[PDB]
Write an enzyme that holds these catalytic residues in place. Structure first.
Site, PDB file in Angstrom:
ATOM      1  N   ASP A 133       0.927  -1.473   0.404  1.00  0.00           N
ATOM      2  CA  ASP A 133      -0.254   0.250   0.124  1.00  0.00           C
ATOM      3  C   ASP A 133       0.366   1.767  -0.129  1.00  0.00           C
ATOM      4  N   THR A 141      -7.495   3.641  -1.743  1.00  0.00           N
ATOM      5  CA  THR A 141      -6.312   2.384  -1.022  1.00  0.00           C
ATOM      6  C   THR A 141      -7.678   1.065  -2.325  1.00  0.00           C
ATOM      7  N   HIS A 199      -0.644   2.828  -5.470  1.00  0.00           N
ATOM      8  CA  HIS A 199      -1.065   3.778  -5.287  1.00  0.00           C
ATOM      9  C   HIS A 199       0.267   4.679  -4.857  1.00  0.00           C
ATOM     10  N   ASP A 226     -21.066  11.006 -26.843  1.00  0.00           N
ATOM     11  CA  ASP A 226     -21.485   9.867 -25.309  1.00  0.00           C
ATOM     12  C   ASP A 226     -21.980  10.968 -24.459  1.00  0.00           C
ATOM     13  N   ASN A 260     -24.501   9.772 -22.352  1.00  0.00           N
ATOM     14  CA  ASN A 260     -24.430   9.166 -21.455  1.00  0.00           C
ATOM     15  C   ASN A 260     -23.483   9.227 -20.648  1.00  0.00           C
ATOM     16  N   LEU A 268     -18.437   5.122 -24.445  1.00  0.00           N
ATOM     17  CA  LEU A 268     -19.199   4.384 -24.841  1.00  0.00           C
ATOM     18  C   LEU A 268     -19.440   5.268 -26.300  1.00  0.00           C
ATOM     19  N   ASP A 307     -22.346   6.374 -28.093  1.00  0.00           N
ATOM     20  CA  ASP A 307     -24.085   6.506 -28.343  1.00  0.00           C
ATOM     21  C   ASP A 307     -24.263   6.500 -30.240  1.00  0.00           C
TER      22      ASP A 307
HETATM   23  C1  LIG Z   1     -15.168  -1.591 -18.732  1.00  0.00           C
HETATM   24  O1  LIG Z   1     -15.570  -3.219 -18.600  1.00  0.00           O
HETATM   25  C2  LIG Z   1     -16.712  -3.373 -18.245  1.00  0.00           C
HETATM   26  C3  LIG Z   1     -17.216  -5.041 -18.301  1.00  0.00           C
HETATM   27  O2  LIG Z   1     -16.986  -5.655 -19.568  1.00  0.00           O
HETATM   28  C4  LIG Z   1     -18.082  -3.158 -19.589  1.00  0.00           C
HETATM   29  O3  LIG Z   1     -18.946  -2.940 -18.860  1.00  0.00           O
HETATM   30  C5  LIG Z   1     -20.024  -3.423 -18.978  1.00  0.00           C
HETATM   31  O4  LIG Z   1     -21.068  -3.283 -20.273  1.00  0.00           O
HETATM   32  C6  LIG Z   1     -22.294  -3.053 -21.208  1.00  0.00           C
HETATM   33  C7  LIG Z   1     -22.669  -2.049 -21.296  1.00  0.00           C
HETATM   34  O5  LIG Z   1     -22.876  -0.950 -20.604  1.00  0.00           O
HETATM   35  C8  LIG Z   1     -23.199  -3.369 -19.454  1.00  0.00           C
HETATM   36  O6  LIG Z   1     -23.763  -4.885 -20.421  1.00  0.00           O
HETATM   37  C9  LIG Z   1     -25.074  -4.539 -20.343  1.00  0.00           C
HETATM   38  O7  LIG Z   1     -25.668  -5.658 -18.769  1.00  0.00           O
HETATM   39  C10 LIG Z   1     -27.060  -5.347 -18.994  1.00  0.00           C
HETATM   40  C11 LIG Z   1     -27.145  -6.423 -17.225  1.00  0.00           C
HETATM   41  O8  LIG Z   1     -25.998  -6.250 -16.727  1.00  0.00           O
HETATM   42  C12 LIG Z   1     -25.730  -6.910 -15.360  1.00  0.00           C
HETATM   43  O9  LIG Z   1     -24.655  -8.309 -15.662  1.00  0.00           O
HETATM   44  C13 LIG Z   1     -23.515  -8.086 -15.682  1.00  0.00           C
HETATM   45  C14 LIG Z   1     -23.430  -9.485 -16.047  1.00  0.00           C
HETATM   46  O10 LIG Z   1     -23.067 -10.421 -15.463  1.00  0.00           O
HETATM   47  C15 LIG Z   1     -23.280  -7.522 -14.223  1.00  0.00           C
HETATM   48  O11 LIG Z   1     -21.498  -6.538 -14.421  1.00  0.00           O
HETATM   49  C16 LIG Z   1     -23.394  -6.220 -14.157  1.00  0.00           C
HETATM   50  O12 LIG Z   1     -23.218  -6.066 -12.998  1.00  0.00           O
HETATM   51  C17 LIG Z   1     -23.109  -4.073 -13.092  1.00  0.00           C
HETATM   52  O13 LIG Z   1     -24.444  -3.823 -12.431  1.00  0.00           O
HETATM   53  C18 LIG Z   1     -24.758  -3.579 -10.754  1.00  0.00           C
HETATM   54  C19 LIG Z   1     -25.429  -3.034  -9.566  1.00  0.00           C
HETATM   55  O14 LIG Z   1     -27.000  -3.124 -10.248  1.00  0.00           O
HETATM   56  C20 LIG Z   1     -22.876  -3.302 -10.163  1.00  0.00           C
HETATM   57  O15 LIG Z   1     -22.535  -4.341  -8.948  1.00  0.00           O
HETATM   58  C21 LIG Z   1     -21.954  -3.485 -10.918  1.00  0.00           C
HETATM   59  O16 LIG Z   1     -20.505  -2.729 -10.739  1.00  0.00           O
HETATM   60  C22 LIG Z   1     -21.853  -3.489 -11.837  1.00  0.00           C
HETATM   61  O17 LIG Z   1     -22.305  -2.220 -12.202  1.00  0.00           O
HETATM   62  C23 LIG Z   1     -21.502  -1.636 -13.785  1.00  0.00           C
HETATM   63  O18 LIG Z   1     -22.839  -1.580 -14.978  1.00  0.00           O
HETATM   64  C24 LIG Z   1     -23.782  -0.792 -14.956  1.00  0.00           C
HETATM   65  C25 LIG Z   1     -24.307  -1.247 -16.106  1.00  0.00           C
HETATM   66  O19 LIG Z   1     -24.517  -3.107 -15.914  1.00  0.00           O
HETATM   67  C26 LIG Z   1     -24.590   0.842 -14.908  1.00  0.00           C
HETATM   68  O20 LIG Z   1     -25.538   0.962 -14.374  1.00  0.00           O
HETATM   69  C27 LIG Z   1     -23.307   0.673 -13.621  1.00  0.00           C
HETATM   70  O21 LIG Z   1     -23.242   2.502 -13.521  1.00  0.00           O
HETATM   71  C28 LIG Z   1     -22.159   0.045 -13.335  1.00  0.00           C
HETATM   72  O22 LIG Z   1     -21.313   1.182 -14.116  1.00  0.00           O
HETATM   73  C29 LIG Z   1     -25.326  -6.290 -14.148  1.00  0.00           C
HETATM   74  O23 LIG Z   1     -25.469  -7.062 -13.179  1.00  0.00           O
HETATM   75  C30 LIG Z   1     -28.156  -6.018 -19.568  1.00  0.00           C
HETATM   76  O24 LIG Z   1     -29.315  -5.119 -18.672  1.00  0.00           O
HETATM   77  C31 LIG Z   1     -27.690  -4.088 -20.627  1.00  0.00           C
HETATM   78  O25 LIG Z   1     -28.710  -4.500 -21.586  1.00  0.00           O
HETATM   79  C32 LIG Z   1     -29.564  -3.439 -21.593  1.00  0.00           C
HETATM   80  O26 LIG Z   1     -29.317  -2.682 -22.867  1.00  0.00           O
HETATM   81  C33 LIG Z   1     -29.938  -3.278 -23.887  1.00  0.00           C
HETATM   82  C34 LIG Z   1     -29.121  -2.537 -25.379  1.00  0.00           C
HETATM   83  O27 LIG Z   1     -28.516  -2.254 -26.075  1.00  0.00           O
HETATM   84  C35 LIG Z   1     -30.530  -4.025 -24.274  1.00  0.00           C
HETATM   85  O28 LIG Z   1     -30.949  -5.084 -25.260  1.00  0.00           O
HETATM   86  C36 LIG Z   1     -31.401  -4.250 -22.801  1.00  0.00           C
HETATM   87  O29 LIG Z   1     -32.859  -4.591 -23.238  1.00  0.00           O
HETATM   88  C37 LIG Z   1     -30.494  -3.964 -21.657  1.00  0.00           C
HETATM   89  O30 LIG Z   1     -31.630  -2.803 -21.667  1.00  0.00           O
HETATM   90  C38 LIG Z   1     -33.076  -2.241 -20.689  1.00  0.00           C
HETATM   91  O31 LIG Z   1     -32.627  -1.878 -19.666  1.00  0.00           O
HETATM   92  C39 LIG Z   1     -32.735  -0.250 -19.612  1.00  0.00           C
HETATM   93  C40 LIG Z   1     -31.874   0.353 -18.492  1.00  0.00           C
HETATM   94  O32 LIG Z   1     -32.471  -0.736 -17.619  1.00  0.00           O
HETATM   95  C41 LIG Z   1     -33.649   0.242 -20.367  1.00  0.00           C
HETATM   96  O33 LIG Z   1     -33.600   1.538 -20.570  1.00  0.00           O
HETATM   97  C42 LIG Z   1     -34.497  -0.705 -21.839  1.00  0.00           C
HETATM   98  O34 LIG Z   1     -35.302  -0.259 -21.725  1.00  0.00           O
HETATM   99  C43 LIG Z   1     -34.622  -1.925 -21.357  1.00  0.00           C
HETATM  100  O35 LIG Z   1     -35.093  -2.169 -20.764  1.00  0.00           O
HETATM  101  C44 LIG Z   1     -26.368  -4.361 -21.013  1.00  0.00           C
HETATM  102  O36 LIG Z   1     -25.934  -5.443 -22.008  1.00  0.00           O
HETATM  103  C45 LIG Z   1     -22.305  -4.912 -18.962  1.00  0.00           C
HETATM  104  O37 LIG Z   1     -23.408  -4.853 -17.523  1.00  0.00           O
HETATM  105  C46 LIG Z   1     -21.052  -4.064 -18.133  1.00  0.00           C
HETATM  106  N1  LIG Z   1     -20.645  -4.744 -16.971  1.00  0.00           N
HETATM  107  C47 LIG Z   1     -19.564  -4.380 -16.032  1.00  0.00           C
HETATM  108  C48 LIG Z   1     -19.815  -5.279 -15.159  1.00  0.00           C
HETATM  109  O38 LIG Z   1     -19.578  -3.319 -16.103  1.00  0.00           O
HETATM  110  C49 LIG Z   1     -17.688  -0.989 -19.778  1.00  0.00           C
HETATM  111  O39 LIG Z   1     -18.288  -0.752 -20.760  1.00  0.00           O
HETATM  112  C50 LIG Z   1     -16.177  -1.206 -19.763  1.00  0.00           C
HETATM  113  N2  LIG Z   1     -15.904   0.202 -20.187  1.00  0.00           N
HETATM  114  C51 LIG Z   1     -14.942   1.270 -20.880  1.00  0.00           C
HETATM  115  C52 LIG Z   1     -15.485   2.256 -20.986  1.00  0.00           C
HETATM  116  O40 LIG Z   1     -15.005   0.548 -22.295  1.00  0.00           O
HETATM  117  C1  LIG Z   2     -10.601  -5.720  -1.972  1.00  0.00           C
HETATM  118  O1  LIG Z   2      -9.748  -5.716  -1.512  1.00  0.00           O
HETATM  119  C2  LIG Z   2      -8.223  -5.533  -0.719  1.00  0.00           C
HETATM  120  C3  LIG Z   2      -8.276  -5.476   0.216  1.00  0.00           C
HETATM  121  C4  LIG Z   2      -7.173  -6.309   0.744  1.00  0.00           C
HETATM  122  C5  LIG Z   2      -7.022  -6.474   2.807  1.00  0.00           C
HETATM  123  O2  LIG Z   2      -7.367  -7.636   3.618  1.00  0.00           O
HETATM  124  N1  LIG Z   2      -6.931  -4.870   2.692  1.00  0.00           N
HETATM  125  C6  LIG Z   2      -7.618  -4.685   4.530  1.00  0.00           C
HETATM  126  C7  LIG Z   2      -6.974  -3.023   4.079  1.00  0.00           C
HETATM  127  C8  LIG Z   2      -7.761  -2.220   5.245  1.00  0.00           C
HETATM  128  N2  LIG Z   2      -7.316  -0.555   4.746  1.00  0.00           N
HETATM  129  C9  LIG Z   2      -7.227   1.020   4.947  1.00  0.00           C
HETATM  130  O3  LIG Z   2      -7.371  -0.018   6.638  1.00  0.00           O
HETATM  131  C10 LIG Z   2      -6.179   1.165   4.922  1.00  0.00           C
HETATM  132  C11 LIG Z   2      -5.044   1.180   4.103  1.00  0.00           C
HETATM  133  C12 LIG Z   2      -4.611   2.837   3.394  1.00  0.00           C
HETATM  134  C13 LIG Z   2      -5.140   3.840   3.945  1.00  0.00           C
HETATM  135  N3  LIG Z   2      -4.738   5.121   2.457  1.00  0.00           N
HETATM  136  N4  LIG Z   2      -6.123   5.892   2.864  1.00  0.00           N
HETATM  137  N5  LIG Z   2      -7.085   5.594   3.276  1.00  0.00           N
HETATM  138  C14 LIG Z   2      -6.432   3.898   4.136  1.00  0.00           C
HETATM  139  C15 LIG Z   2      -7.170   2.677   4.910  1.00  0.00           C
HETATM  140  C16 LIG Z   2      -6.983  -1.032   3.304  1.00  0.00           C
HETATM  141  C17 LIG Z   2      -7.697  -2.927   2.730  1.00  0.00           C
HETATM  142  C18 LIG Z   2      -7.173  -3.493   1.996  1.00  0.00           C
HETATM  143  C19 LIG Z   2      -6.154  -6.880  -0.127  1.00  0.00           C
HETATM  144  C20 LIG Z   2      -6.658  -7.365  -0.970  1.00  0.00           C
HETATM  145  C21 LIG Z   2      -5.330  -7.579  -1.523  1.00  0.00           C
HETATM  146  C22 LIG Z   2      -5.975  -7.146  -3.671  1.00  0.00           C
HETATM  147  C23 LIG Z   2      -6.755  -7.480  -4.133  1.00  0.00           C
HETATM  148  C24 LIG Z   2      -7.275  -6.532  -3.369  1.00  0.00           C
HETATM  149  C25 LIG Z   2      -7.346  -6.577  -2.008  1.00  0.00           C
HETATM  150 CA   LIG Z   3      -3.227   2.361  -0.190  1.00  0.00          CA
HETATM  151 CA   LIG Z   4     -22.287   6.391 -24.958  1.00  0.00          CA
HETATM  152 ZN   LIG Z   5      -3.910   5.656   2.511  1.00  0.00          ZN
END
Ligand SMILES: *[C@@H]1O[C@H](CO)[C@@H](O[C@@H]2O[C@H](CO)[C@@H](O[C@@H]3O[C@H](CO[C@H]4O[C@H](CO)[C@@H](O)[C@H](O[C@H]5O[C@H](CO)[C@@H](O)[C@H](O)[C@@H]5O[C@H]5O[C@H](CO)[C@@H](O)[C@H](O)[C@@H]5O)[C@@H]4O)[C@@H](O)[C@H](O[C@H]4O[C@H](CO)[C@@H](O)[C@H](O)[C@@H]4O[C@H]4O[C@H](CO)[C@@H](O)[C@H](O)[C@@H]4O)[C@@H]3O)[C@H](O)[C@H]2NC(C)=O)[C@H](O)[C@H]1NC(C)=O
Ligand SMILES: COc1cc(C(=O)N2C[C@@H]3CN(C(=O)c4ccc5[nH]nnc5c4)C[C@H]3C2)cc2ccccc12
Ligand SMILES: [Ca+2]
Ligand SMILES: [Ca+2]
Ligand SMILES: [Zn+2]
Ligand code: NA
Ligand code: NA
Length: 806
Positions: free
Chosen positions: A121, A159, A309, A683, A685, A689, A691
């Site tokens: 870290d 972190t 970092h 872009d 939204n 990616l 639009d």
């Molecule tokens: C970096 O890499 C990543 C990963 O490859 C890229 O992200 C992907 O981009 C895709 C497009 O944006 C996206 O695909 C969508 O998936 C939807 C299903 O999503 C769920 O399942 C996946 C797979 O397991 C999962 O990973 C998702 O996880 C996200 O959501 C939860 C929160 O709910 C989070 O825990 C997680 O962090 C992640 O969040 C992130 O992504 C979401 C979008 O999914 C954002 O909202 C967040 O802000 C955050 O960034 C999900 O659990 C699927 O439903 C989508 O399909 C819709 O759109 C198409 C259009 O063609 C359509 O066919 C469908 O009908 C559907 O539309 C319907 O819903 C619309 C909205 O509600 C509505 O308007 C319509 O009318 C329809 O009803 C879509 O295919 C993919 O999920 C993400 N993956 C991840 C991990 O983020 C990313 O783009 C890369 N970045 C760059 C710059 O290149």
């Molecule tokens: C998913 O998160 C992952 C978690 C861990 C993991 O055990 N911990 C426990 C540590 C607690 N912690 C801080 O209290 C803290 C530290 C520096 C800061 N600077 N400013 N504020 C700060 C606050 C940092 C966490 C990391 C290992 C991974 C190792 C590899 C990949 C992911 C890991």
């Molecule tokens: Ca750190």
């Molecule tokens: Ca876009």
């Molecule tokens: Zn720190």
């Protein structure tokens, strides 16, 4: 509830996590207040310390000791890491000469070289050189294995966002860990460093390496360690797991150190107190490598030494207070420090207005040390907007500074001398990468790269298929001896049309005019050749970009430039031209100032019109290929084609015209010619990616001409600048930008001055990777070069940062 009355007998640091109310014995039980009653006695033994001494050698096994020096310890897998050195006449790993590991040398039963991630870290990149004298084990890994001079973290340079980016290959906006502190308005829940909400799986998106491995049948050690477990015990636990029977033994492991970050916050990045933490981390590396050597694994395991970092000098006196700017300071909630995030204090307050808050924060004090942005206006290279947990208003804080709401926050919360979180291109925030092992190259230095790329490589190292992520798989093949991933280029989806002359001038009713009716087989055949692509090899140096989505577009050739013209968006998707070192800049002649010319290859119905610009009082127009760089007076008329026109706010035209008139020529002088590809980006939204047509929120008034959110340029030349850009035999050199298309220059506090004092600064801030442009446009560049595809992928991930030497 936890029934802590069960026992850890034979379960110490068990890999399968047991659920409540059964008591736990895993490496996180402490953090959950769930360890069995006897966890400390059995699992955290400390008796007699961590090192064998002469008198302990061949001792009778005493199960109370922290580690052992008895004859049976090797077979039990629990010797102190220096056992073979003290008792059996062996050398420390650090003392052995570096010898190339050409093939894995693994004990029988090992199906694959294990991977150990050693994460540190706050380990700033310059510590590798500056602390080298006190880190011999680390220096040996670095010099003997594969190393980068630095590794770029993700923004914010905090972190948890960076550790989880390491584990997932995803940007924070995608994995969901967008800060060390967060509010999710859908959950109505808060994520903090302290407390239990952070353990809820709903925060953690994507698919981290340990889950990827488990799903594909590769066992993983637990990555996380409760802070109270000493480092020596973490190392002994990893070494013990590596002695498990084949079917039980993990293939991937992580060690984590809170140092040097912990001390860096207190003492600053180069405080004299920092030597000791660096020594201690090196000693821990030494313990691991000695233990691997005992297990005969030191030429089998791949070890990655990686930081999250760096660390900058920051003190309490360098804090900006929002209370010196805003009248309404109690109407906002601020997430403070090395970045700021602002939202309304109450959702019931309808006198809250982000526009008045941004304006009160914009260029208000001469030396202001932060800049406000709506998140969609942040540099696209930060990829920090597409998540509901990221507040609409963001403050980008200058390095060395903090932002806070009110002075009382800073003294009734100087303590600290270091912090991190700033823009991920800042030199002080850069961190470290070393890979050592059979699968990494020997004594090899690789260029700096981004931490989002590592997940794919870690998957490669383990024979795993990566979950979809933001790395560019193959871009880091040059780090690896074997296990390279050999990607194929994506298939083009849309093929272009090649229109000839199909329209008479009178068919157009665009409301445009040009003084071009001033008028030869010597020159007429030649002009026809130019329109059929006879100069194309000069201006399109790396093949035409491939269009990776379904659309209708035309290739248009000209003497000085080639373009891919979208019939759907009514303007080029890309425009390509080469400017040699010898090229001359000219002016727009007086009679051509307002000249726009119908393009007889493209229908009136698929053309822009001048009347829309006349009537839209906010919107003007610019050209993608600049008239200033025309090769001849006659060629200049091509630059005024309606098919080379794009909509531009007058304020943006200041920026664009300076880039085109002054900077392109400057780059061609410095780089020995440049090839330029420019174009629009949409872009609306802010998802990073391209639009589709139905996502466009703004048009030139009265028309179907879409307004770009951004304009890009990709500027390529020969890495060996003794060769001109258009006759380059070897590797390429690139810089690119994605400029926000904004109706004001409020971002640039010095914009009332001459463009020479502020435009290039703006462009530097909006530097980009070719890959970032690919995502935003659905285009694929560099399709036809003499270079290997992997080399081209590395070129596409390159970011020109404009920072000085690390
Ligand atoms: C970096 O890499 C990543 C990963 O490859 C890229 O992200 C992907 O981009 C895709 C497009 O944006 C996206 O695909 C969508 O998936 C939807 C299903 O999503 C769920 O399942 C996946 C797979 O397991 C999962 O990973 C998702 O996880 C996200 O959501 C939860 C929160 O709910 C989070 O825990 C997680 O962090 C992640 O969040 C992130 O992504 C979401 C979008 O999914 C954002 O909202 C967040 O802000 C955050 O960034 C999900 O659990 C699927 O439903 C989508 O399909 C819709 O759109 C198409 C259009 O063609 C359509 O066919 C469908 O009908 C559907 O539309 C319907 O819903 C619309 C909205 O509600 C509505 O308007 C319509 O009318 C329809 O009803 C879509 O295919 C993919 O999920 C993400 N993956 C991840 C991990 O983020 C990313 O783009 C890369 N970045 C760059 C710059 O290149
Ligand atoms: C998913 O998160 C992952 C978690 C861990 C993991 O055990 N911990 C426990 C540590 C607690 N912690 C801080 O209290 C803290 C530290 C520096 C800061 N600077 N400013 N504020 C700060 C606050 C940092 C966490 C990391 C290992 C991974 C190792 C590899 C990949 C992911 C890991
Ligand atoms: Ca750190
Ligand atoms: Ca876009
Ligand atoms: Zn720190
Ligand atoms: Na106008
Ligand atoms: Na300004």
């Amino acid at each position: 509830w936890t029934a802590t009355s069960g026992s850890c007998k034979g379960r110490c640091f068990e890999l399968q996590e047991v659920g409540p109310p059964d008591c736990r014995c895993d490496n996180l039980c402490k953090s959950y207040s769930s360890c069995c009653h006897d966890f400390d006695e059995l699992c955290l033994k400390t008796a007699r310390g961590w090192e064998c001494t002469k008198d302990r050698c061949g001792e009778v096994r005493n199960e109370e000791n922290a580690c052992h020096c008895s004859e049976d310890c090797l077979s039990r897998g629990d010797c102190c890491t220096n056992y073979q050195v003290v008792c059996k006449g062996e050398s420390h790993w650090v003392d052995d000469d570096c010898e190339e590991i050409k093939v894995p040398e693994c004990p029988a039963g090992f199906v694959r070289p294990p991977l150990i991630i050693f994460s540190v870290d706050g380990f700033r990149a310059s510590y590798m050189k500056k602390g080298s004298k006190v880190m011999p084990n680390i220096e040996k890994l670095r010099s003997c294995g594969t190393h980068a001079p630095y590794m770029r973290p993700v923004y914010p340079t905090k972190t948890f966002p960076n550790l989880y980016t390491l584990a997932t290959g995803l940007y924070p906006e995608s994995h969901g860990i967008v800060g060390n502190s967060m509010y999710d308005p859908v959950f109505d829940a808060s994520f903090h460093l302290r407390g239990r909400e952070k353990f809820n799986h709903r925060w953690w998106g994507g698919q981290p390496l340990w889950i990827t491995a488990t799903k594909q049948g590769v066992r993983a050690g637990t990555f996380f360690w409760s802070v109270s477990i000493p480092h020596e015990r973490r190392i002994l636990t990893i070494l013990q797991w590596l002695s498990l029977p084949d079917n039980e033994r993990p293939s991937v492991y992580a060690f984590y150190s809170e140092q040097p970050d912990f001390s860096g916050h207190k003492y600053g990045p180069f405080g004299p107190e920092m030597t000791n933490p660096l020594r201690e981390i090196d000693k821990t590396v030494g313990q691991l490598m000695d233990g691997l050597k005992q297990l005969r694994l030191h030429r089998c395991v791949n070890v990655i030494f990686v930081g999250d970092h760096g660390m900058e000098d920051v003190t309490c006196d360098r804090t900006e207070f929002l209370s010196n700017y805003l009248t309404n300071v109690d109407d906002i909630t601020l997430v403070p420090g090395t970045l700021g995030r602002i939202r309304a204090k109450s959702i019931n307050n309808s006198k809250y207005d982000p526009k008045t808050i941004i304006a009160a924060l914009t260029c208000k004090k001469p030396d202001q040390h932060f800049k406000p942005y709506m998140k969609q206006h942040l540099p696209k290279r930060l990829h920090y907007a597409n998540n509901r947990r990221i507040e609409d208003i963001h403050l980008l804080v200058d390095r060395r500074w903090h932002v806070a709401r009110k002075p009382l926050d800073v003294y009734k919360k100087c303590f600290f001398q270091g912090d991190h979180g700033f823009d991920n291109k800042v030199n002080s925030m850069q961190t470290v990468f070393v890979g050592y092992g059979p699968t990494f190259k020997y004594r090899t230095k690789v260029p700096p790269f981004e931490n989002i790329e590592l997940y794919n490589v870690m998957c490669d190292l383990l024979g795993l298929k990566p979950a979809p992520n933001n790395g560019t798989h193959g871009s880091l093949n040059h780090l690896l001896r074997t296990n390279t991933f050999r990607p194929t280029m994506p298939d083009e989806v849309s093929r272009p049309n090649y229109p000839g002359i199909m329209y008479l001038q009178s068919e157009f009713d665009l409301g445009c005019t040009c003084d071009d009716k001033v008028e030869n087989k010597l020159e007429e055949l030649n002009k026809r050749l130019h329109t059929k692509g006879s100069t194309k090899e000069r201006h399109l140096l790396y093949g035409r970009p491939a269009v990776l989505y379904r659309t209708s577009y035309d290739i248009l050739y000209h003497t000085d430039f080639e373009s891919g013209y979208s019939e759907i968006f009514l303007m080029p998707l890309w425009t390509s031209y080469t400017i040699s070192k010898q090229a001359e800049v000219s002016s727009i002649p007086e009679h051509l100032t307002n000249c726009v010319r119908p393009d007889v290859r493209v229908s009136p119905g698929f053309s822009q019109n001048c009347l829309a610009y006349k009537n839209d009082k906010q919107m003007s127009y610019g050209f993608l290929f600049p008239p200033y760089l025309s090769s001849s007076p006659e060629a200049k008329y091509d630059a005024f084609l309606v098919t080379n026109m794009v909509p531009m706010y007058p304020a943006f035209k200041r920026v664009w015209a300076y880039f085109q008139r002054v900077l392109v020529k400057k780059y061609a002088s410095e780089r020995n010619g440049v090839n330029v590809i420019s174009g629009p980006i949409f872009d609306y939204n802010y998802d990073g990616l391209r639009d589709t047509e139905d996502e466009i929120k703004q048009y030139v008034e009265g028309s179907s001409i879409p307004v770009p959110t951004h304009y890009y340029s990709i500027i390529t030349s020969c890495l060996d600048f003794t060769q001109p850009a258009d006759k380059c035999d070897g590797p390429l050199s690139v810089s690119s930008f994605i400029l926000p298309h904004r109706p004001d220059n409020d971002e640039s506090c010095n914009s009332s001055e001459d463009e020479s004092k502020w435009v290039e600064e703006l462009m530097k801030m909006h530097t980009a990777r070719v890959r970032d442009i690919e995502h935003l446009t659905g285009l694929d560049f560099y399709r036809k070069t003499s270079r290997s595809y992997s080399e081209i992928l590395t070129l596409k991930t390159y970011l020109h940062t404009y920072e000085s030497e690390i």
